[PDB]
Design a protein around this nucleic acid. Structure first.
Ligand SMILES: Nc1nc2c(ncn2[C@@H]2O[C@H](COP(=O)(O)OP(=O)(O)OP(=O)(O)O)[C@@H](O)[C@H]2O)c(=O)[nH]1
Ligand SMILES: N[C@@H](Cc1ccccc1)C(=O)O
Ligand SMILES: [Mg+2]
Ligand SMILES: [Mg+2]
Ligand SMILES: [Mg+2]
Ligand SMILES: [Mg+2]
Ligand SMILES: [Mg+2]
Ligand SMILES: [Mg+2]
Ligand SMILES: [Mg+2]
Ligand SMILES: [Mg+2]
Ligand SMILES: [Mg+2]
Ligand SMILES: [Mg+2]
Ligand SMILES: [Mg+2]
Ligand SMILES: [Mg+2]
Ligand SMILES: [Mg+2]
Ligand SMILES: [Mg+2]
Ligand SMILES: [Mg+2]
Ligand SMILES: [Mg+2]
Ligand SMILES: [Mg+2]
Ligand SMILES: [Mg+2]
Ligand SMILES: [Mg+2]
Ligand SMILES: [Mg+2]
Ligand SMILES: [Mg+2]
Ligand SMILES: [Mg+2]
Ligand SMILES: [Mg+2]
Ligand SMILES: [Mg+2]
Ligand SMILES: [Mg+2]
Ligand SMILES: [Mg+2]
Ligand SMILES: [Mg+2]
Ligand SMILES: [Mg+2]
Ligand SMILES: [Mg+2]
Ligand SMILES: [Mg+2]
Ligand SMILES: [Mg+2]
Ligand SMILES: [Mg+2]
Ligand SMILES: [Mg+2]
Ligand SMILES: [Mg+2]
Ligand SMILES: [Mg+2]
Ligand SMILES: [Mg+2]
Ligand SMILES: [Mg+2]
Ligand SMILES: [Mg+2]
Ligand SMILES: [Mg+2]
Ligand SMILES: [Mg+2]
Ligand SMILES: [Mg+2]
Ligand SMILES: [Mg+2]
Ligand SMILES: [Mg+2]
Ligand SMILES: [Mg+2]
Ligand SMILES: [Mg+2]
Ligand SMILES: [Mg+2]
Ligand SMILES: [Mg+2]
Ligand SMILES: [Mg+2]
Ligand SMILES: [Mg+2]
Ligand SMILES: [Mg+2]
Ligand SMILES: [Mg+2]
Ligand SMILES: [Mg+2]
Ligand SMILES: [Mg+2]
Ligand SMILES: [Mg+2]
Ligand SMILES: [Mg+2]
Ligand SMILES: [Mg+2]
Ligand SMILES: [Mg+2]
Ligand SMILES: [Mg+2]
Ligand SMILES: [Mg+2]
Ligand SMILES: [Mg+2]
Ligand SMILES: [Mg+2]
Ligand SMILES: [Mg+2]
Ligand SMILES: [Mg+2]
Ligand SMILES: [Mg+2]
Ligand SMILES: [Mg+2]
Ligand SMILES: [Mg+2]
Ligand SMILES: [Mg+2]
Ligand SMILES: [Mg+2]
Ligand SMILES: [Mg+2]
Ligand SMILES: [Mg+2]
Ligand SMILES: [Mg+2]
Ligand SMILES: [Mg+2]
Ligand SMILES: [Mg+2]
Ligand SMILES: [Mg+2]
Ligand SMILES: [Mg+2]
Ligand SMILES: [Mg+2]
Ligand SMILES: [Mg+2]
Ligand SMILES: [Mg+2]
Ligand SMILES: [Mg+2]
Ligand SMILES: [Mg+2]
Ligand SMILES: [Mg+2]
Ligand SMILES: [Mg+2]
Ligand SMILES: [Mg+2]
Ligand SMILES: [Mg+2]
Ligand SMILES: [Mg+2]
Ligand SMILES: [Mg+2]
Ligand SMILES: [Mg+2]
Ligand SMILES: [Mg+2]
Ligand SMILES: [Mg+2]
Ligand SMILES: [Mg+2]
Ligand SMILES: [Mg+2]
Ligand SMILES: [Mg+2]
Ligand SMILES: [Mg+2]
Ligand SMILES: [Mg+2]
Ligand SMILES: [Mg+2]
Ligand SMILES: [Mg+2]
Ligand SMILES: [Mg+2]
Ligand SMILES: [Mg+2]
Ligand SMILES: [Mg+2]
Ligand SMILES: [Mg+2]
Ligand SMILES: [Mg+2]
Ligand SMILES: [Mg+2]
Ligand SMILES: [Mg+2]
Ligand SMILES: [Mg+2]
Ligand SMILES: [Mg+2]
Ligand SMILES: [Mg+2]
Ligand SMILES: [Mg+2]
Ligand SMILES: [Mg+2]
Ligand SMILES: [Mg+2]
Ligand SMILES: [Mg+2]
Ligand SMILES: [Mg+2]
Ligand SMILES: [Mg+2]
Ligand SMILES: [Mg+2]
Ligand SMILES: [Mg+2]
Ligand SMILES: [Mg+2]
Ligand SMILES: [Mg+2]
Ligand SMILES: [Mg+2]
Ligand SMILES: [Mg+2]
Ligand SMILES: [Mg+2]
Ligand SMILES: [Mg+2]
Ligand SMILES: [Mg+2]
Ligand SMILES: [Mg+2]
Ligand SMILES: [Mg+2]
Ligand SMILES: [Mg+2]
Ligand SMILES: [Mg+2]
Ligand SMILES: [Mg+2]
Ligand SMILES: [Mg+2]
Ligand SMILES: [Mg+2]
Ligand SMILES: [Mg+2]
Ligand SMILES: [Mg+2]
Ligand SMILES: [Mg+2]
Ligand SMILES: [Mg+2]
Ligand SMILES: [Mg+2]
Ligand SMILES: [Mg+2]
Ligand SMILES: [Mg+2]
Ligand SMILES: [Mg+2]
Ligand SMILES: [Mg+2]
Ligand SMILES: [Mg+2]
Ligand SMILES: [Mg+2]
Ligand SMILES: [Mg+2]
Ligand SMILES: [Mg+2]
Lengths: 205, 60, 82, 85, 393
RNA sequence: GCCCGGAUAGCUCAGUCGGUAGAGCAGGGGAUUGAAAAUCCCCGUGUCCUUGGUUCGAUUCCGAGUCCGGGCACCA
RNA sequence: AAAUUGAAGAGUUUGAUCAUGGCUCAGAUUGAACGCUGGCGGCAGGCCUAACACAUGCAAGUCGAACGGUAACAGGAAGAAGCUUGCUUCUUUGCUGACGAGUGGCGGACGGGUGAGUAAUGUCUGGGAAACUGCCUGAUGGAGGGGGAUAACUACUGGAAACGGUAGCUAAUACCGCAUAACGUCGCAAGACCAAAGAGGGGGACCUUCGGGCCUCUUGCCAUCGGAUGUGCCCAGAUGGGAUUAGCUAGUAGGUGGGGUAACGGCUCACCUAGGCGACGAUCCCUAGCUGGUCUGAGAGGAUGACCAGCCACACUGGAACUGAGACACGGUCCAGACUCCUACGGGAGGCAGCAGUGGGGAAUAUUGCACAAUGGGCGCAAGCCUGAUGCAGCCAUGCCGCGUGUAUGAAGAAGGCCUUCGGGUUGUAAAGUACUUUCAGCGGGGAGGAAGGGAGUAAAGUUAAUACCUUUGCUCAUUGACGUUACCCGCAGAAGAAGCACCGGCUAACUCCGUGCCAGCAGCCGCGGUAAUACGGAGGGUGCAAGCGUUAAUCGGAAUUACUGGGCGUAAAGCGCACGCAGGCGGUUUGUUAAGUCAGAUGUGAAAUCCCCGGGCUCAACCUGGGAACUGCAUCUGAUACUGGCAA
């Protein structure tokens, strides 16, 4: 169901910073990033056309914390929806509750946001929700319950979110731990680096 | 028919009831099947660790 | 004898009755002439719940179709009751 | 057999003893008309037809004979009387 | 399997013991017709105790047959043993579950070699009490000859470590009580009184968790495979989880009906022979020797340390030394099993009549715990009793 | 539950009525030709299916077992 | 508003090449199986072979308002006998309520199960009728007088049993007269002919001969004519493969006449004619339930028809009918055969392709589950009682979906492993430790919604002679859950209980080395392995996938490698040796004329589910579900008549 392994190892293999081990400190400089995937990171890969696609797919999975079976289902939904197939893949991932909770600032990492969702802390439209893959509808109000409000893990994690870019599509109160998911996320608003194109190709064959 | 006994060593002899799966060897002309190691009287291969679903061996 | 009865569809522990005009001999879920609305017992206080097309009921009950114990009361529920 | 509604296995045995008797009675009275037809003028045939007409209609009403069976046994049989004699 | 067995009167597991062709099985036939006539229980006959081709053309019994005769005080449950030298293996299962035996020595022949072998197997396994019965009497019309046989039985029991003189010796012909002789019917009614008086109420273990050794597996065109045996400890409720442990490996199961001589039961209590029914198990895969335990209580083992007491010539056993590689038969609860011996360091040879511990690797695994009693046998005779010390596997 | 047969070095078989078991084919310390048809030398290379007993001494005589072969039964 | 956004290649012939062309692989799948590791929930699923043989419990009963029964049973009332005079014994009483048995009525033909047969009798769409239709219902109103008998019960026997006989006796809505008859049946019409059953809840008035005469109402019973409903038939096309099956066929093909069918018909007969089918595949052969759909595909197609739903077919194997509104009848009948059982050797029972269960054959596949609470379904005037229908309790990762085996910080870049150019690298922020949360499991307490009703009493409105009963509607009562220690909620304790198995030369993301030296083995293809291996075992980093993953079988895909969309035939496989020519396919050209094709429109229909879009509903999700589109149809009816055909000049 979850990875629960060495998280920063995934970032080296992929190369870029995946925000798995983001947390309290801003920058790591604490893994020999890029040049050490495993025992043979010095080996320059040839890297085929199937490779680059499969690396790009694994990047987007490992960022959002999703497995192949559930990720393949997002592609199937993304294809059936109107407009661009690539933009839908990412938009459906960004609409996940564990992703929204991370983007609100209620969690130093996305795994923390997932557990915070799982453990009955998160609540939306006056209803408790346990599911990380809960598709957050446009015009919703995610929030933390009064029992687990202002605990140790959340207040330190919300201060990290000030250093972050902060999305335009959602808004956060910050005083009373209350969020507001407004519109669906745009392509140009977020990332500007992870290529959807190559993921659309991989599943088509 | 004839069936190839995979792995190193075996407990098959004379009779002994064995389970047979499909799959040619591509070497022995005529042989077009494999004996499933682990199933029925055909025991697992002794001292195999990697790839033990094939060859029917338990945990270490 | 044609009769207006509930068909019972829906998942386990979550019934959804398809009130339907069928022959008495035919099975519960099987053969029918035409479906005439529905009933949802686990709908609760919200938007939808029970819908029953009363114009089609007059076409069969007026002719000669018996109404079952439940469908007779869902007529009593939709008309007046409140 | 493994039912208390076996009653119907006898009850129906009791039925056909009676049901064959009234049926056989009718078809003998119809045979009496067909016997009169062949070599007989407009007299003996219509007497036999006047006798069986009440008997065939009665058995039609009880559910032994269907009303169409009875209708033919008049229709085709009156034509034998009408055409020949 | 229709009438419900009402739990009234204490259950006691009785059985006949004695020489070959000594009126051992015929005693069981006499006890049924005598008790059923006067008191008013179920009748039965001498045929149903032993039919088949094997016990007709020959006449000799092999299978441990069972009988259920009732009395005012107690509800007895008979276990007729085979008796011959060839049938000692299936006898020990019948003799282990037996609480209080009925010895059968006869007034014409007297004590014989098997009688000594039977009582030898009774002590080491578990036979607390024993009662003598002279099973001929009428043939030799004499006062002095019949009474001289009674003396040698008192000698045998006292020589082999039983009460001997205290045991109530009874006389009576089995064939005479089968028909309807008023003097001989009353004399076997006296044996029923001796069973009540001498043998006390047996001590059960209805507290510590469920275990049941299997004596004989059936495939009842009924329900499925059925297993018979005395419940050694605990209870058996219907629709309860039961783990079958012993030979081969281990299999999960559930009880779906306990019974007592073709009659229904709710709770199969300890210390009584019951036919427990198993769900989803074939006739071949489950075999004799395995035990019906509660899940988690017992685990099958193929290696164990054990304090073995080897017997000498006087007690009845080996008379020569032996070294590692010796393979005798280890009789645990019901079945026997072969196993190689590995002696401790600083012990060159095991002399007869000696107390030592030793590791024993068995060829078949059997369910066992610390403090389990067993009796070693080899070559149609006993070798040494002992107890389990430590588990290894 | 009980009656019977079967097992001999890596494989296929000889040998026994107590005198301590051998043959080919095998294979190995073994030489030829980058490996080689034909060559040489060389060992048996052994829990006599396992274990105990009668015994000076058991493959061999007598119990008990192993797994496998085929045979006859019992229905809580 | 929307209703499709959907089309990848690679290895492999050669010294190298381009082509041709096979071979193999990457992805989807599933009634899967086995293998390895073996924690959860939700909605599903689960003998494909032997349509094999079956023990044990069950699966269709039900009605006292049809009637004898003064009752088998359990219990009140007039009276009796014991004696603790109300404690006990006990005969009468329709008399206490009901009901074992029985005739009756209506159900058992529906509802469940399985594909043996079936290549058309069947199935699909579209048609037509020449029909019947219990119970539902719209009219037309009758519904009057009788009489044998007949079980049960006796009585008396026969039989080992199953199951009878003979003598009475009696009951009914049972059963047959009877008068009675229509817009009914028959006839050219005049005529003739044709039916029924009473119950039950209540009653003022007057008959009481007390059985109550008699009025009310509710229901039954009839008579056709019409509904609605199923069912029977019939025609059109469609519905597998084979020509190494081209001839088949005598009730065969048609006619007249008789019989029979609910209905028409060689359905069946007698005679008459000599046909009929057939190259747009008869015949014979092999295989096969069919469909909605399912899987796959860019789509066309290809394959398939488990689960759910419609239709057919079959019930130990071959027959036949009886009864019925409906059967030529899964748990009716009677034969016949084979197979097990019982016996007094004479004759008897006998049907799991219901639901559990079992033995078998097998790669393989459930509980001798609990309940009518629920929607049905049966009978009933209602309560009811029956139900393996249905729901649901368990089992199995066989699956689909969603959860979890924590989530931050953490450098001495520790130890240990593995590699090394012995400098170090790597395992690795991995772990240890520090921040903490504590969804699931586990405990302890709250607790919905599936429940509509049914029942007992009340005020009124109908009904009527009547403030009575009856019918209807408000209104007060106490209740109805197999699931169920429920869904869901809240407190508790402490990361505590919680992992996978592939492969890693190439194709295909992933290599270092100790190698078992063409031995052991690998392998899906090319190929590896012969004292320095990314291709074998092993340790070991990863690569990869997750409660599953592999291997295997099976269908499609890629395969434009059966090509209609969409290939070819000089030399790669492939132009008959060359003509003539009927059937068939195609056909120059201008004016008419039709409307077959063709297109446009319209109406009917294309079952529901499924798919799709828009939605909604369960903590989200699978899942369920409201509403539209679609179902490449077909049918008709009316129009364009350019183009094709026909009929013209
Ligand atoms: N004279 C006499 N003979 C008796 C009596 N009881 C039994 N028997 C005989 O003993 C025999 C019975 O032997 P059992 O030992 O009971 O039979 P069994 O147990 O099957 O025999 P095994 O199995 O060989 O021990 C019969 O043949 C009888 O004739 C008795 O009271 N008197
Ligand atoms: N408890 C059983 C004993 C038994 C075992 C085997 C056969 C007969 C009886 C009874 O019956
Ligand atoms: Mg999952
Ligand atoms: Mg694709
Ligand atoms: Mg293959
Ligand atoms: Mg491999
Ligand atoms: Mg609610
Ligand atoms: Mg009802
Ligand atoms: Mg006759
Ligand atoms: Mg006659
Ligand atoms: Mg008349
Ligand atoms: Mg009739
Ligand atoms: Mg449009
Ligand atoms: Mg696609
Ligand atoms: Mg080459
Ligand atoms: Mg060449
Ligand atoms: Mg499996
Ligand atoms: Mg397995
Ligand atoms: Mg398990
Ligand atoms: Mg389910
Ligand atoms: Mg089948
Ligand atoms: Mg078949
Ligand atoms: Mg078959
Ligand atoms: Mg069968
Ligand atoms: Mg019973
Ligand atoms: Mg039965
Ligand atoms: Mg009455
Ligand atoms: Mg009755
Ligand atoms: Mg039937
Ligand atoms: Mg049928
Ligand atoms: Mg069905
Ligand atoms: Mg049916
Ligand atoms: Mg089934
Ligand atoms: Mg099927
Ligand atoms: Mg089918
Ligand atoms: Mg047809
Ligand atoms: Mg038909
Ligand atoms: Mg039509
Ligand atoms: Mg009509
Ligand atoms: Mg009727
Ligand atoms: Mg009827
Ligand atoms: Mg009628
Ligand atoms: Mg009416
Ligand atoms: Mg009118
Ligand atoms: Mg009028
Ligand atoms: Mg009227
Ligand atoms: Mg009369
Ligand atoms: Mg009379
Ligand atoms: Mg008579
Ligand atoms: Mg008479
Ligand atoms: Mg009378
Ligand atoms: Mg009368
Ligand atoms: Mg009548
Ligand atoms: Mg008259
Ligand atoms: Mg008149
Ligand atoms: Mg007319
Ligand atoms: Mg009358
Ligand atoms: Mg009246
Ligand atoms: Mg009355
Ligand atoms: Mg009157
Ligand atoms: Mg119709
Ligand atoms: Mg003819
Ligand atoms: Mg008919
Ligand atoms: Mg394609
Ligand atoms: Mg098909
Ligand atoms: Mg099926
Ligand atoms: Mg089902
Ligand atoms: Mg179905
Ligand atoms: Mg049909
Ligand atoms: Mg038949
Ligand atoms: Mg037939
Ligand atoms: Mg036929
Ligand atoms: Mg009829
Ligand atoms: Mg019919
Ligand atoms: Mg039929
Ligand atoms: Mg027929
Ligand atoms: Mg049946
Ligand atoms: Mg027969
Ligand atoms: Mg039976
Ligand atoms: Mg039966
Ligand atoms: Mg079954
Ligand atoms: Mg089975
Ligand atoms: Mg098998
Ligand atoms: Mg049960
Ligand atoms: Mg039940
Ligand atoms: Mg029941
Ligand atoms: Mg009940
Ligand atoms: Mg109840
Ligand atoms: Mg009901
Ligand atoms: Mg009523
Ligand atoms: Mg019942
Ligand atoms: Mg499980
Ligand atoms: Mg899906
Ligand atoms: Mg620790
Ligand atoms: Mg708990
Ligand atoms: Mg709620
Ligand atoms: Mg409720
Ligand atoms: Mg209510
Ligand atoms: Mg409610
Ligand atoms: Mg009421
Ligand atoms: Mg009252
Ligand atoms: Mg209850
Ligand atoms: Mg309960
Ligand atoms: Mg609780
Ligand atoms: Mg729910
Ligand atoms: Mg803590
Ligand atoms: Mg701790
Ligand atoms: Mg070699
Ligand atoms: Mg393959
Ligand atoms: Mg080296
Ligand atoms: Mg490889
Ligand atoms: Mg390797
Ligand atoms: Mg590893
Ligand atoms: Mg698989
Ligand atoms: Mg193609
Ligand atoms: Mg080509
Ligand atoms: Mg050429
Ligand atoms: Mg060529
Ligand atoms: Mg050629
Ligand atoms: Mg040419
Ligand atoms: Mg031509
Ligand atoms: Mg043409
Ligand atoms: Mg032209
Ligand atoms: Mg032409
Ligand atoms: Mg046209
Ligand atoms: Mg058109
Ligand atoms: Mg339309
Ligand atoms: Mg549809
Ligand atoms: Mg829909
Ligand atoms: Mg939306
Ligand atoms: Mg939705
Ligand atoms: Mg929703
Ligand atoms: Mg909602
Ligand atoms: Mg769906
Ligand atoms: Mg719809
Ligand atoms: Mg629509
Ligand atoms: Mg449109
Ligand atoms: Mg369309
Ligand atoms: Mg479609
Ligand atoms: Mg026109
Ligand atoms: Mg023109
Ligand atoms: Mg024009
Ligand atoms: Mg033209």
């Amino acid at each position: 169901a979850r990875y629960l392994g060495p998280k920063l190892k995934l970032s080296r293999r992929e190369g870029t910073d995946l925000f798995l081990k983001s947390g309290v400190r801003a920058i790591d400089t604490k893994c020999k990033i890029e040049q050490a995937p495993g025992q043979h990171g010095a080996r320059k890969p040839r890297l085929s056309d199937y490779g680059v696609q499969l690396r790009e797919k694994q990047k987007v999975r490992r960022i959002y914390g999703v497995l192949e079976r559930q990720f393949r289902n997002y592609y199937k939904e993304a294809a059936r929806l109107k407009g661009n197939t690539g933009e839908n893949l990412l938009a459906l991932l960004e609409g996940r509750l564990d992703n929204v909770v991370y983007r609100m600032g209620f969690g130093a990492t996305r795994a923390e946001a997932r557990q915070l969702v799982s453990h009955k802390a998160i609540m939306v439209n006056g209803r408790v929700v346990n599911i990380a893959s809960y598709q957050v509808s446009p015009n919703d109000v995610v929030s933390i319950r009064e029992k687990a409000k202002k605990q140790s893990r959340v207040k330190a994690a919300l201060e990290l979110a000030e250093q972050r870019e902060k999305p335009t599509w959602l808004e956060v109160d910050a005083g009373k731990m209350e969020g507001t998911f407004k519109r669906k996320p745009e392509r140009s608003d977020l990332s500007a680096d992870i290529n959807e194109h190559l993921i659309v190709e991989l599943y088509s064959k | 028919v004839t069936s190839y006994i995979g792995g190193e060593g075996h407990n098959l002899q004379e009779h002994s009831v064995i389970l047979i799966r499909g799959g040619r060897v591509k070497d022995l002309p005529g042989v077009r099947y494999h004996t499933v190691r682990g199933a029925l009287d055909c025991s697992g291969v002794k001292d195999r660790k990697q790839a033990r679903s094939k060859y029917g061996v338990k945990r270490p | 004898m044609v009769t207006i009865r509930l068909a019972r569809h829906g998942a386990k522990k979550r019934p959804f009755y398809q009130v339907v005009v069928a022959d008495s001999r035919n099975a519960r879920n099987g053969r029918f002439i035409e479906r005439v609305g529905f009933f949802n017992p686990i709908a609760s206080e919200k938007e939808e719940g029970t819908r029953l097309d009363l114009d089609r009921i007059a076409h069969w009950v007026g002719q000669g179709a018996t109404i079952s114990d439940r469908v007779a009361a869902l007529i009593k529920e939709v008309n007046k009751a409140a | 057999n493994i039912k208390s509604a076996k009653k119907r296995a006898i009850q129906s045995e009791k039925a056909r003893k009676h049901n064959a008797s009234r049926r056989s009675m009718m078809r003998t009275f119809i045979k009496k008309v067909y016997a009169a037809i062949e070599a007989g003028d407009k007299a003996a045939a219509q007497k036999a037809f006047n006798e069986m007409q009440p008997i065939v209609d009665r058995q039609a009403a009880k559910g032994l004979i269907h009303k169409n069976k009875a209708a033919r046994h008049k229709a085709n049989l009156t034509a034998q009387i009408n055409k020949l004699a | 399997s229709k009438e419900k067995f009402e739990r009234t009167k204490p259950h006691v597991n009785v059985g006949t013991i004695g020489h070959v062709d000594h009126g051992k099985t015929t005693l069981t036939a006499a006890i049924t017709t005598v008790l059923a006539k006067t008191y008013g229980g179920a009748a039965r006959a001498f045929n149903q105790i032993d039919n088949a081709p094997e016990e007709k053309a020959r006449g000799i019994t092999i299978n441990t047959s069972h009988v259920e005769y009732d009395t005012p005080t107690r509800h007895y449950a008979h276990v007729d043993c085979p008796g011959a030298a060839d049938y000692v293996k299936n006898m020990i299962t019948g003799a282990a579950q037996m609480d209080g035996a009925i010895l059968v020595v006869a007034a014409t022949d007297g004590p014989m070699p098997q009688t000594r072998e039977h009582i030898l197997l009774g002590r080491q396994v578990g036979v607390p009490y024993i009662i003598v019965f002279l099973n001929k009497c009428d043939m030799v019309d004499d006062e002095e000859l019949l009474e001289l046989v009674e003396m040698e039985v008192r000698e045998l029991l006292s020589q082999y470590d039983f009460p001997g003189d205290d045991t109530p010796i009874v006389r009576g012909s089995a064939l005479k009580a089968l028909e309807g002789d008023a003097e001989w019917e009353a004399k076997i009614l006296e044996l029923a009184g001796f069973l009540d008086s001498y043998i006390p109420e047996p001590e059960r273990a209805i507290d510590k968790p469920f275990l049941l050794p299997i004596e004989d597996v059936f495939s009842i065109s009924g329900r499925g495979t059925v297993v018979t045996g005395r419940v050694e400890r605990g209870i058996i409720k219907v629709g309860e989880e039961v783990e079958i442990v012993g030979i081969k490996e281990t299999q999960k199961s559930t009880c779906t009906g306990v019974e007592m001589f073709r009659k229904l039961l709710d709770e199969g209590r300890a210390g009584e022979n019951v036919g427990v029914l198993l769900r989803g198990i074939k006739r071949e895969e489950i075999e004799r020797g395995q035990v019906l335990a509660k899940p988690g209580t017992i685990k099958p083992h193929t290696k164990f340390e054990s304090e073995v007491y080897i017997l000498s010539k006087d007690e009845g056993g080996r008379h020569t030394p032996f070294f590692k590689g010796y393979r005798p038969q280890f009789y645990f609860r019901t079945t026997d099993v072969t196993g190689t011996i590995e002696l401790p360091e600083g012990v060159e040879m095991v002399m007869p009549g000696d107390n030592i511990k030793m590791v024993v690797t068995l060829i078949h695994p059997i369910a066992m715990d610390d403090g389990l009693r067993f009796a070693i046998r080899e070559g149609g005779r006993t070798v040494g009793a002992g107890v389990v010390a430590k588990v290894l596997s």
